[PDB]
Every structure is written in structure tokens, then in C-alpha cells.
Amino acid sequence: LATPSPFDMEKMVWLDVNILEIRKSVLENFGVDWSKQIPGPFAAFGKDFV
Amino acid sequence: LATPSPFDMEKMVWLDVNILEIRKSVLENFGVDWSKQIPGPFAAFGKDFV
């Protein structure tokens, strides 16, 4: 004839979460940048034999 | 011969909810910003041997 409870009281849990992030960066760009491809010498010939 | 009730009177529950929020921010931008890429020296040569 016994009856159950509507529900069972459960233990409660507390959760503590930490998330830590650090970012660092360095950027340098220095010097003299020259041309690396330049025109070369040229030669040409032309004649009319007849 | 007994009959059930049309329904059962249940207990009534009051819920009180509080949500609190605060945001703060600072933004600074100061100094002098110069050019970092400038034209460099140039040289050119040209000749007609024949």
C-alpha cells in the first residue's frame, strides 16, 4: 500500500570555469628593395642586297 | 461506488527572477602616424654605340 514520492531531491553542483588567453605579436619590415629584372642590350641589322 | 474528484487542487508557486548586467569600456587613440614605405633612389643609363 506504500506510495512513492513525487520526485527525489538531488544534490546540487556548482561549476566554476576560468578561461585565460594572452596573445602577442611583433612585425618588422625594413631595408631597401631594388629592381631585380632590367632590360639588356640590343642589336639589329638590316640590308637590301638587291 | 466511490467517484473521483474532477481534478486535484495543486499548490501554487511564485517565481521571482532577477537579471543584472553592467558593461564598461574605454577607447583611446593617440599619437602621430607617419609613412612607412617611401620611394628610393633611381639610376638609368642609355647609349647608342652604332
**Structural determination approach:** cryo-EM
CA-wise closest residue to B49 among A44, A38, A47: A44
- How far the first Cα of chain B sits from its last, in Å, is 133
Residue B38 phi, psi dihedral angles, 5° rounding: -130, 155
**Nearest-angstrom CA–CA distance, A48 and A31:** 54
Distance from CA of A36 to the nearest CA of B (A): 13
Among B50, B2, B12, smallest CA distance to A42 is for: B50
- How many angstroms separate the CA atoms of A16 and B49, rounded? 85
Q: Which amino acid is at B39?
A: P
Resolution of this deposited model, Å = 2.4
Q: Measured between CA atoms, how close is B2 to chain A, in angstroms?
A: 19
CA distance B40 to B28: 34
Q: Which residues of B touch A29 (CB under 8 A)?
A: 36
